[PDB]
Structures are given as C-alpha cells and as structure tokens.
C-alpha cells in the first residue's frame, strides 16, 4: 500500500557489506554517544576495499598452488608477500598457517 518497497541501504550504496548490521553494532558498541548516518557507509567501503584486495592476493596465491579452493596457507602467503599489508598484519598470527619459504642468504 502506502509503504514503499524496501531498499536495503547496502543497495543504495551499491556495496555488499551489511549497512544495517553495522548500524546496530555501532549503536551497541558504545564508542560514541550518537551514530552519524554516513559513517557506517564509509567504514563499509573501507572493509569492502580491504577484503577485495586481500582476496585478490589470496586468489593469485591459490593459482600459484594450482588449487581453486582457499586454504589458510594461501592467506598466509598472500599476507606476508605484500609489504603494506605486512606493516598492517605483522602483529597478527594466522591460524593453520606456515611461515614464508625463506632460507637465509648463506646457501652456498
């Protein structure tokens, strides 16, 4: 009737990350007294960019292993093979992960 057909706010942003769930978590997160309207959309864009870039590195790392399904080994190799992410994710330890294939320079 008089109620319009519901558009999700993610569809208004053209993004995939859930805007409404993030709005609820900012309301119960209690970081700030009030929650502005454009701020969860901006944050959602930031997460979409981060997940897209990390998944792109993970997909190329999966193509190097000739596998089409992502294992944590692919994330570990994708994360430490990018220096700007290495500054981002240096301090996190990744579960089910190995280390880089790095043998020290005295090989002979």
């Amino acid at each position: 009737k008089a109620r319009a057909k519901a558009k999700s706010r993610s569809s208004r942003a053209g993004l995939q990350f859930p805007v409404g769930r993030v709005h609820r978590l900012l309301r119960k997160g209690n970081y700030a007294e009030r929650v502005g309207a454009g701020a969860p959309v901006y944050m959602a864009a930031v997460l979409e960019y981060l997940t897209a870039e990390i998944l792109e590195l993970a997909g190329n790392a999966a193509r190097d292993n000739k596998k089409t399904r992502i294992i944590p080994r692919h994330l570990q190799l994708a994360i430490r093979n990018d220096e700007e992410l290495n500054k981002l994710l240096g301090k996190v330890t990744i579960a089910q992960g190995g280390v880089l294939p790095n043998i020290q320079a005295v090989l002979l």
Binding site: K7, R9, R12, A13, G14, L15, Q16, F17, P18, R21, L25, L26, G29, Y31, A32, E33, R34, V35, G36, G38, A39, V41, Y42, M43, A44, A45, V46, L47, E48, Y49, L50, T51, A52, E53, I54, L55, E56, G59, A62, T68, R69, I70, I71, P72, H74, L75, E84, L85, K87, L88, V92, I94, A95, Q96
Partner: protein, 94 residues
C-alpha cells in the same frame, strides 16, 4: 535460539565478484570473519578516541575518514578514502 551472526555470506559475495570460480573452506572463512571483526574494532577505537579528544559526541564520516587515514599505512588508506568517497556520493542520492 542463538543466531551466531557472521560475515561469511558477504565474504562469499565479494569473493564471487572478484574471482568467479574460487571456493573457500570453513577455517579460512573463520579467519576472514575474525579478521573483519578485528579491523572493525581498531577503526571503532580510533573513532572513539578521536571523538573524545576533540569534545564531539557523534562520529560523522569525517571522523572515520581521518581514522582510516591514521591507522592504515600508505596508499592503501588513500585508495580506501577513494572508495569511501565513491560510497558517500552514491549514498546521499535517492
């Protein structure tokens, strides 16, 4: 009962857009899920500290903008700012 909300399905959709035929196991999906929660908590901490330091009560988009500029290093943050601007310019319409 318990809903146990996770970002699994959104990770699946963005994965489907960037790489069509690539799948993901459950442990790597949990890795992505806790990763998204962690970067969320850091950005919320930056917004909370900056909102309290300058005597503002609300987080607007400018606060998240300077927060993402502060926490992620280098050009990754700049392209994230570009993504945010393209988000906000389509959010304010319709």
């Amino acid at each position: 009962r318990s809903r146990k909300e996770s970002y699994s399905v959104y990770v699946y959709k963005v994965l489907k857009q960037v790489h069509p035929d690539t799948g993901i196991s459950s442990k790597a999906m949990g890795i992505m899920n806790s990763f998204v929660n962690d970067i969320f908590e850091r950005i919320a901490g930056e917004a909370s500290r900056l909102a309290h330091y300058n005597k503002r009560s609300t987080i607007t988009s400018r606060e998240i903008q300077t927060a993402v500029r502060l926490l992620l290093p280098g050009e990754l943050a700049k392209h994230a700012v570009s993504e945010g601007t393209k988000a906000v310019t389509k959010y304010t319409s319709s």
